[PDB]
Amino acid sequence: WMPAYACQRPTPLTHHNTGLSEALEILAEAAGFEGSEGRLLTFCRAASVLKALPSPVTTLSQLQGLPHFGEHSSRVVQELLEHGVCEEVERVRRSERYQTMKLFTQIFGVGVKTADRWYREGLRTLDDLREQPQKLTQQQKAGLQHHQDLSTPVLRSDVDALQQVVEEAVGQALPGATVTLTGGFRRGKLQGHDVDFLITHPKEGQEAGLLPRVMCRLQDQGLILYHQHAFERSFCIFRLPQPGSWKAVRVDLVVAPVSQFPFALLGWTGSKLFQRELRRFSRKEKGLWLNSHGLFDPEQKTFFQAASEEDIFRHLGLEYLPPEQRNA
């Protein structure tokens, strides 16, 4: 039929059930704002099943046998098919709680727990936060100052410009190091809200200490509007040129040794749901523990060597999916 794990099926970026999947994703997001990770996962998984179907769902009949469709998710789809709207979804959409939690958690440096505390304190707007700046972290101050630019979609044209700049700094920091585009743009997205890069070097060990050297060089070139500072992940805000001005862009930089590069490439290419499902599959179906550093057999107490993403899918007994089919 339809397999139960998202890593077992191709999921393209564009598909035939966009409206249905978007509605279920609203309910998933709302569940996350209420701390119900289980409900969030079911609604995310149900949405992803629809993304993987070969044609539009027209009749409730067509949901029979699909994994992750039970009474609740089927009723949502039934209302959308019959009336074009689901009352529960529309109620969530217009709710003050949903709109405020969405606004607050979109802030770089603000998670669900912080947003919820602010909501309970009575805060509702960005200007509310700006009027009490002593309660903010430096990271949150940065996220709030740059929030407007960070709400503007990053375009593929923007990505090519950023990659050349990152390569320049990486080349001075360590000749021979390479820069690979990851995240949503590697999956074929035409827009995004950040750019993700993975950096390595072909000689194992030479990447040790690389990211501080890369960051200092970017910072000396005036391109870093914010970053946290030894480390291997950097979540920063870049200054990106624009016609007669510039805009702030979120950029994630990650370093891995070449021995781990296939695992890090897999992990950082996503999607987020794809990776959660793949790690769940590995552990629950194969008894293997997967992360962005490796794949561990806890019985033999050994790590799998991988030279490619293809190797990792083979180790796990899964058909290979290119990045553009990992859009779970």
Add this chain to the structure above:
DNA sequence: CGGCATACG
């Protein structure tokens, strides 16, 4: 019923 990814800053 228990489980729900798995890390680093």
Add this chain to the structure above:
DNA sequence: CGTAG
């Protein structure tokens, strides 16, 4: 607590 896919 934040961040990431």
Add this chain to the structure above:
DNA sequence: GCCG
């Protein structure tokens, strides 16, 4: 919320 759903699966096994």
